[PDB]
């Protein structure tokens, strides 16, 4: 069997301003690898993860299940503006080692005040569109 070895997941969160959430928003599960056997999701802390990131939105890629032991993968997160352009990109500098149940991401992905300022056009109609591009280098 062949494998989906790179993939891009687009996720829109409606009414983001009214996200009454350390509380997590979880995306749908999406699949990768051979026979859809690698399962992933995105997880968002809209008000931060811990106290040191209260001013930020945190965003993580989580490996939900995998057939073997480890998966090594590079990943990139970005926000799509109204024009569909990628902006505020952050990417792993290297492949990270994932095992079933483990996440990797950015506690300080983006400042809340920057995200909430309408002049930056990142919440058109109160909608946050995240973009996650993954490249699996092993498994």
């Amino acid at each position: 069997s062949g494998k989906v070895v790179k993939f891009s997941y687009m996720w829109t969160i409606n009414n983001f301003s009214f996200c009454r959430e350390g509380e997590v928003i979880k995306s749908s599960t999406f699949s990768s690898g051979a026979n859809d056997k690698l399962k992933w999701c995105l997880r968002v802390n809209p008000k931060g993860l811990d106290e040191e990131s209260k001013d930020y939105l945190s965003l993580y890629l989580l490996l939900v299940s995998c057939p073997k032991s480890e998966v090594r993968a590079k990943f990139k997160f970005s926000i799509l503006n109204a024009k569909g352009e990628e902006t505020k990109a952050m990417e792993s500098q290297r492949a990270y080692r994932f095992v079933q149940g483990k996440d990797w991401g950015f506690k300080k992905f983006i400042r809340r005040d920057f995200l909430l300022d309408e002049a930056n056009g990142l919440l058109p109609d109160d909608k946050l569109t995240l973009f996650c591009e993954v490249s699996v280098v092993q498994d």
Binding site: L49, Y60, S92, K102, D103, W104, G105, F106, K107
Partner: peptide, 7 residues
């Protein structure tokens, strides 16, 4: 650098 929330 990326961070993880799980031990």
């Amino acid at each position: 650098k990326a961070d993880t929330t799980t031990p």
